[PDB]
């Protein structure tokens, strides 16, 4: 399951990480179509040149925030689901017919989840510097003549939801670091 457990997960990996993951899922569900639903259609530019709106939008939004967060959530949930599948497979094999291997697998899964969180946060920072979206953008790309003034839709609400998602991801990274440190200390 999401942020799955393996009989080795502590309190900060069984109680808090699952809550944060569910919170992110619910926020993404309630903001996916309400806020970013008309990101493309409501996006208009101040020009008479045909085809300038689409090229400007693709220039300023290479990949939307909602879909980037969706990919981040899917890739974060993948290692936990893989670990759960492996645990079920091992149980089935034992029934048809070990703790240290499971412990190391869980540690590697937490490490990979932390790595995915960090890389997705870095990608988000690289694509969209800052936490705020501006109402007006200046675009100079073919076929738009010189510079044109495009207007983004709902910058303030998108900024609020971006702050929420970034804070949640930072909390997830902190909790993953704490979980890794706690497991290392307990093992030694």
- Give residues in contact with its own copies (CB under 8 A): 46-49, 138, 145-149
Separation CA 14–CA 2 (nearest Å): 10
Instruction: Give least dist CB 130 to its own copies, A.
Output: 23
Nearer to its own copies, 17 or 148 (CB): 148
Q: How far is the CB of 142 from its own copies (least distance, A)?
A: 13
Closer Cβ to its own copies, 62 or 145, answer by number: 145
> Using an 8 Å Cβ cutoff, are 53 and 44 in contact?
yes
Smallest distance, Å, CB 124 to its own copies? 30
> Is residue 48 exposed (0-12), middle (13-18) or buried (19+ Cβ within 10 Å)?
exposed
- Nearest distance from residue 39's CB to its own copies, in Å? 21
Q: Which is nearer to its own copies, 135 or 138 (CB)?
A: 138
Q: What sign for the dihedral angle of Cα 105, 107, 108, 110? A: positive
> Considering beta carbons, is residue 99 or 146 the nearer one to its own copies?
146
Between the alpha carbon of residue 49 and those of residues 137, 147, 150, the distances in Å are 17, 12, 13
Q: Which stretch of DSSP H or E encloses residue 186?
A: helix 155-187
Torsion of CA 65, 70, 72, 73, to 10 degrees: 140
Residue placing its CB nearer to its own copies in the complex, 46 or 156 = 46
The minimum distance between CB 60 and its own copies, in angstroms, equals 16
């Amino acid at each position: 399951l999401l942020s799955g457990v393996n009989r080795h997960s502590t309190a900060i990996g069984r109680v808090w990480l699952s809550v944060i993951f569910i919170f992110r899922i619910m926020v993404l569900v309630v903001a996916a179509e309400s806020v970013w639903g008309d990101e493309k259609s409501s996006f208009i530019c101040n020009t008479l040149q045909p085809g300038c709106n689409s090229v400007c939008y693709d220039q300023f939004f290479p990949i939307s925030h909602v879909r980037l967060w969706s990919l981040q959530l899917i890739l974060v949930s993948t290692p936990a689901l893989l670990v759960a599948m492996h645990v079920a497979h091992q149980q089935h094999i034992e029934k048809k017919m070990i703790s240290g291997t499971l412990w190391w697998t869980y540690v590697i899964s937490v490490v990979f989840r932390l790595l995915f969180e960090a890389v997705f946060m870095y990608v988000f920072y690289l694509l969209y510097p800052g936490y705020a979206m501006v109402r007006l953008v200046k675009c100079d790309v073919y076929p738009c003549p010189n510079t044109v003034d495009c207007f983004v839709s709902r910058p303030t609400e998108k900024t609020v939801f971006t702050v929420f998602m970034l804070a949640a991801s930072g909390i997830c990274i902190i909790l993953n670091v704490a979980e890794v440190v706690y497991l290392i200390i307990r093992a030694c």
